[PDB]
């Protein structure tokens, strides 16, 4: 909401370090957050009438942004479903939706993940951006165990104006991203 616990932290606790850290000149020039994406393949638009909207009202139930129903671009014999419509669910988070999300994720989510011993440190690489996956979806607060017929993993991709990994690394690190280190 224009401001959050993490947003502040970034501005008055991370902003400083990085500069002092890599020594940036211009204000802008220092790592900021562009957007964090969270999609789901599902691949379950098969027979039995693949509603799987529950996964849409949910994906967004924990995000606050109804997702965008992506479809198959080509068409594959090998694993049924092809040519069009079928599967695909994905929402793009920016600004405040971006912050009020990462918070929970970093504070309440990542925490309870079967074993979770930090976040694999290689998922950066050349990417002034980062990527990571989740098996469950109940790892979040806004949703409980009872209500969720089936499971639902998902990919989370954070984009950064960072050019290097160190730049990206440090940032997500000063923010609160745990790390398999």
């Amino acid at each position: 909401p224009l401001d959050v616990a993490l947003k502040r932290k970034y501005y008055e606790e991370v902003r400083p370090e990085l500069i002092r850290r890599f020594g940036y000149q211009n204000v802008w020039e220092v790592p900021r957050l562009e957007k964090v994406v969270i999609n789901q393949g599902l691949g379950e638009a098969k027979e039995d009438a693949r509603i799987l909207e529950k996964a849409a009202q949910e994906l967004a139930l924990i995000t606050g942004q109804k997702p965008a129903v992506t479809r198959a671009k080509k068409s594959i014999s090998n694993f049924k479903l092809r040519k069009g419509m079928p599967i695909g669910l994905r929402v793009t988070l920016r600004r405040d939706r971006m912050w009020i999300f990462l918070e929970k994720l970093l504070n309440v989510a990542l925490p309870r993940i079967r074993d979770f011993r930090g976040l694999n440190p290689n998922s950066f690489d050349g990417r002034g951006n980062y990527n990571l996956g989740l098996r469950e979806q109940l790892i979040f607060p806004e949703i409980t165990y009872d209500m969720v017929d089936a499971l639902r993993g998902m990919d989370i991709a954070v984009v950064t104006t960072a050019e290097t990994d160190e730049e990206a690394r440090a940032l997500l690190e000063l923010l609160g991203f745990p790390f398999r280190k």
């Binding site: 909401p1 959050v4 616990a5 139930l61 924990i62 606050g64 009020i100 918070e103 929970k104 504070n107 309440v108 925490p111 309870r112 607060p141 806004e142």
Partner: peptide, 30 residues
Amino acid sequence: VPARIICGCGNVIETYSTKPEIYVEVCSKC
């Protein structure tokens, strides 16, 4: 809407989302 994270590991979290009635059975305490 704002919210509250009522874990068990003490530690409450005042932020935003939907339904400020959250029983986070395990915050960042492990």
